[PDB]
Amino acid sequence: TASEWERFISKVEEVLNDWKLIGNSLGKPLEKGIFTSGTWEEKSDEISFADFKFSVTHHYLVQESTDKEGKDELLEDVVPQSMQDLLGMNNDFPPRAHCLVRWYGLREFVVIAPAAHSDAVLSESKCNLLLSSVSIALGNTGCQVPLFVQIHHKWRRMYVGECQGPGVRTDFEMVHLRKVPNQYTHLSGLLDIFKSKIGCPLTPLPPVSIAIRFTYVLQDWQQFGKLPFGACEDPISELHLATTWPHLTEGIIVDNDVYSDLDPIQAPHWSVRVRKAENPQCLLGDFVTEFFPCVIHAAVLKVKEEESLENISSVKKIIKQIISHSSKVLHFPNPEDKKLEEIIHQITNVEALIARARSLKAKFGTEKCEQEEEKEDLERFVSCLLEQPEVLVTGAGRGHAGRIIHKLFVNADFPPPAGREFILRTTVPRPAPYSKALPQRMYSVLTKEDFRLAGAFSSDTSFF
Amino acid sequence: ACSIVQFCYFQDLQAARDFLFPHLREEEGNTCKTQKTSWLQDCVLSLSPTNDLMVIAREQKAVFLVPKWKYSDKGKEEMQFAVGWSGSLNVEEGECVTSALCIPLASQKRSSTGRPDWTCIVVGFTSGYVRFYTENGVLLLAQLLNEDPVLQLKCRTYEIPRHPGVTEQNEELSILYPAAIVTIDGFSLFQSLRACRNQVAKAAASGNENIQPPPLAYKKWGLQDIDTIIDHASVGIMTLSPFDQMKTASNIGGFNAAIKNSPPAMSQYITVGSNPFTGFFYALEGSTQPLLQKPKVEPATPLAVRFGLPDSRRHGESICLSPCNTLAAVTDDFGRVILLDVARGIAIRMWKGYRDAQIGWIQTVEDLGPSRVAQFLVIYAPRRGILEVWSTQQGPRVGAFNVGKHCRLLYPGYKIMGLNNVTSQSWQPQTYQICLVDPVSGSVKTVNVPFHLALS
Numbered sequence: 008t009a010s011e012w013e014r015f016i017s018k019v020e021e022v023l024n025d026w027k028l029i030g031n032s033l034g035k036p037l038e039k040g041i042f043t044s045g046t047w048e049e050k051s052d053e054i055s056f057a058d059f060k061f062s063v064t065h066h067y068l069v070q071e072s073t074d075k076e077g078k079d080e081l082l083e084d085v086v087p088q089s090m091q092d093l094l095g096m097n098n099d100f101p102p103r104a105h106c107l108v109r110w111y112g113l114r115e116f117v118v119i120a121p122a123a124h125s126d127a128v129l130s131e132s133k134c135n136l137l138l139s140s141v142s143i144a145l146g147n148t149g150c151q152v153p154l155f156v157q158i159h160h161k162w163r164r165m166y167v168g169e170c171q172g173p174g175v176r177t178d179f180e181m182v183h184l185r186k187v188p189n190q191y192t193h194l195s196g197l198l199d200i201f202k203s204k205i206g207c208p209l210t211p212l213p214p215v216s217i218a219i220r221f222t223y224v225l226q227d228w229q230q231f232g233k234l235p236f237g238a239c240e241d242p243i244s245e246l247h248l249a250t251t252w253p254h255l256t257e258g259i260i261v262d263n264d265v266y267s268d269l270d271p272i273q274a275p276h277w278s279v280r281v282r283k284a285e286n287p288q289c290l291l292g293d294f295v296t297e298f299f300p301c302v303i304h305a306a307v308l309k310v311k312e313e314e315s316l317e318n319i320s321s322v323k324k325i326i327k328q329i330i331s332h333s334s335k336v337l338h339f340p341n342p343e344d345k346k347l348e349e350i351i352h353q354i355t356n357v358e359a360l361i362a363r364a365r366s367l368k369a370k371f372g373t374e375k376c377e378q379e380e381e382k383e384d385l386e387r388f389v390s391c392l393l394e395q396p397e398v399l400v401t402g403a404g405r406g407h408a409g410r411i412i413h414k415l416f417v418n419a420d421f422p423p424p425a426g427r428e429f430i431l432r433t434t435v436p437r438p439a440p441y442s443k444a445l446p447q448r449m450y451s452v453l454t455k456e457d458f459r460l461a462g463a464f465s466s467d468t469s470f471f
Numbered sequence: 472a473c474s475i476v477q478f479c480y481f482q483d484l485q486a487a488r489d490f491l492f493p494h495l496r497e498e499e500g501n502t503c504k505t506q507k508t509s510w511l512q513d514c515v516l517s518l519s520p521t522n523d524l525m526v527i528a529r530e531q532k533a534v535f536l537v538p539k540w541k542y543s544d545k546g547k548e549e550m551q552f553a554v555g556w557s558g559s560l561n562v563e564e565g566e567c568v569t570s571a572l573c574i575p576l577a578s579q580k581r582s583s584t585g586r587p588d589w590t591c592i593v594v595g596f597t598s599g600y601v602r603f604y605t606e607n608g609v610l611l612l613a614q615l616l617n618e619d620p621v622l623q624l625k626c627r628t629y630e631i632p633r634h635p636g637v638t639e640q641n642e643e644l645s646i647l648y649p650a651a652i653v654t655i656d657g658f659s660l661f662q663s664l665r666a667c668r669n670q671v672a673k674a675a676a677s678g679n680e681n682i683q684p685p686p687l688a689y690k691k692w693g694l695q696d697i698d699t700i701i702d703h704a705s706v707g708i709m710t711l712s713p714f715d716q717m718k719t720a721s722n723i724g725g726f727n728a729a730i731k732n733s734p735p736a737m738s739q740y741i742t743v744g745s746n747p748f749t750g751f752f753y754a755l756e757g758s759t760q761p762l763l764q765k766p767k768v769e770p771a772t773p774l775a776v777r778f779g780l781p782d783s784r785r786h787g788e789s790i791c792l793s794p795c796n797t798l799a800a801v802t803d804d805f806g807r808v809i810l811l812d813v814a815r816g817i818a819i820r821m822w823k824g825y826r827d828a829q830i831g832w833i834q835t836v837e838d839l840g841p842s843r844v845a846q847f848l849v850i851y852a853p854r855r856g857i858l859e860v861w862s863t864q865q866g867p868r869v870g871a872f873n874v875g876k877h878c879r880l881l882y883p884g885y886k887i888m889g890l891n892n893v894t895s896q897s898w899q900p901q902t903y904q905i906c907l908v909d910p911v912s913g914s915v916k917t918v919n920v921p922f923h924l925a926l927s
Contacts, residue, residue, distance in 0.1 A: 135816050
C-alpha cells in the first residue's frame, strides 16, 4: 500500500514511537504553581508526506518521579492521566504558559504544525484528512498523550486535537470569533452552550462548577562635572489588575443580561501585573554613549550614590563581575568596542531598573504614609513586582495595600474589564445513560474584539 | 461463544439457475472439475426481513420464491423456499434490472398474528424505470424518474429508540442516480401500494375498471463537484448545537463571518466513488416544496458537496450505516475497509486485506441506562472464504468462521414498513439482521453473537 495518506500515517506512527509515548502513564497530582515554578522542555522533528512540510513539536513539564519500583500497576478502571488532569483546579490561570497549557490545563502535549511558515491549512477537507490520520495514528500505536493539529492560520491560533484511552475518547475543539449574539456575553449563555453540547439524555444534572476571573487595565497615572542621570518619560506603561473567584457553584449567584453579582471588590484574591514602557529614554545610558577610559568609571560611583538609599543589592555583584571581566581585557592592545557595548548595556539596565523602582514607589506612595508598619508593608509590596509579573495583594481590595489600588482606579466602581475568563467543569455519563461517567471541561475568554471557547468533551467509544 | 445456526433449506435452486442461465443447463472419463458458483455473486438478490419471500433476478428475468412448511419424517414443519413465480420483467427492448427490494407491509387491522399484509417488490431498470410488483408477479405500478440507469435503492423503516436520547427519522425510500438523488416519502408509498393492490384485487373479481395512475412524491436533487459516484447512504435529518453551529460557521467563513440566530435543519447524505473518494452532502430541509412518463421533471434543488476526503486514485465501491446511524463502513478498490464517524466526517479504524468484501452489522442488547447495547461489525472476505466479526469501533476480532468462497452476506437494514410507536411495543413478529446464503448447501443461515464477549 503505502499511498500518500498511508505514508503520512506511517510517518506519524514513527514520530510517536521514537519518543516512547506509547503505553500507560501514572504519576503524582500536580501541586499549586507547578506550572509557574517549574520548567518546560521541548523536542522537535520534521515530517512531509507528499509536498506539505509539517513540524512535530512535543512539549512536556519536568517531573521528578522518585519511585520507580512500581511495575506500572494497572487497575480494571483506569481513566487516562490527561482525562483526570482536565479537572485540576490548583493551577488555574498560570501567569506564563503555552496557550494549550493555559486553556486545557495539560502537562504533556504533542503538536503537528506547518513546518516553518507561509503555510496554512484552509479547506475543510485537508483539516479533516489530517484529523483522520491523527485518529488512526492514536488508535494504532496506543499513545494516550493528546495530539493537536494547527488549522486556519498561525495568527488565529486554532487547533483541533484528540486524546484516546481504553473505551474513552476526548475531543479538544476550539472556536474563535469576533462578534456573537448578545446572549453569549454572560455566564448563563455560556452554561446553556455547555449543557447543550453535553447533550446527555439524563436531563437531571449536577450543577457545573465555575471559575471566574476579570482583567482591568489602567494607563493614566493622574499626577562641576556632574553626570546627568534620570528617565524623561515614565518607564512603566500600564497596570493590570486581575480579580479571581477560585471556586463557585451554579445557582449560588446570578449573571445575566439584567442582574450580575461579579463585583471586583468581593473577589477573595487580588493579583497585580505591571507593564514596562518601551524605550524609556534615560539620561545616563546615552550621555557617555555619545563618546563611544575616564567615562567608564563615572557611572560605577554615580549609580552607587543613587542606590545607596535604594539598596537594590544586584549592581554590587554585577559591578564585581564587570571588574573581573575587565581585569584582563582593560589593557589588550587596541581595545575593542565589545566591552564598551557590554558596560553600556549593564549601565542602562541598572539605571532603568532604579528609575522603574522610583516610579513604582512614587505611584503607590510607600513614603506617603504615617503608619511605619503599613508604609513598610507598602515598600515590601513595591519592588517585588519588578522581578516577577504577578504579586498578591494583602486582604484583596479590603486591605490598605489594596485600598490604594482601589483609589487610583476610582480616581481614573471599576472600569469595564477588558477581559473576562470563565472555566466550567462537569462529570456526566455521555452520550448514553448506560455509558461511563466522563469529565467535560470548557474554557472561555471574552474581550472587546475576541471571543474564544476551548472545550474538552469526552465520550464513550465502547457503549455509545 | 459466537455460533452460526442453519435456519432454512432451499427445496430446489438448480431450477432457478437453469431458468436464469439457460446455457448452463456421459463422457469417456474426461477430467471434469473446476466447478464453482459465481451466478449468485452475479445476480440481484433480496430476501424479505420477515422471511416471507425471495427475489432473485439475473438480467431481465426474476424468480420469486415463496416459503412452504413441510412436515418431515419427524413431523417438524421445516422452512423450505419453493419457486413461487418466474418470468421476464422487460417491457421495452434492451431493458435490464439494476436492483431489487422486498418490503413487508404492516397490517392496519391490529392483527396480533405475525402476518404482514404482503411483501411488495420494488425493481429498478437500466432505462430509468421503477416498477412495483406483488408476490404473485402481477404488475402494480411503473414509474420513470430519470432516463439514466437506476443505481441503488435504499428503504428506511421504523425502529424503536435504544434510550431517551435516541431520536426518530422519517420513513423514506431513496433512489440513487449517477449524478442525482431521488427520494420518495414512505407514507406516499404506503397510501399508493395498498390502493393499487385493492384496485387490482377488485378488478380481478368486481371487475373494477382501470384507474388513472396517481403520481408519487418526487424530489430530485442535482449532485455536483463529483466525478464518479457508486453508492450512497441517507443519514437523514439532523440538528446542530450552538457550539457546533459556531464551529462550522467559523471554519466555513473566517474572522468576519456572521452567525445566524436560527440554526437551519440540514439533511445529510454520503456518497462514495471517485474524485473525490467520499463526499458529504448537506441539503436545506423545508427550503423547496416536494414535487408531486417524463424524465425531464425539474430538479427540486441543486446539491453541491460541502466537503469530503479527496483521493483521486482511490475508488470507493460501497457504504453501509450502523444500526445506531452513528458509524459508516466504506470499502475501496485497494482491498481495504474504513470506518467513519458520520457526525465528524473523520475515519476511526481502517482494516486491511479485504478485496471485494461485504459488510454487515449485528446489534446485541444486554438482557436485564436501559441496557448496555453493543454493535459488532461483520467482514466477509470471499476470496479467502472467511467471515469475521469485529467490534463497533475498536476491540479484538470477536469471531472468525470458515464458510464457502461462494456464499453471500445479506444485510437488509430495514424492518416492517408502516408500523408506528404504539403498534411496535404492543406486539411484533420475528425479524433478522443478517443472513448468509450458500450455494453448495443451498441453505440460508444466521449468525448469533452473545453480548457478554464485548466486556472482554
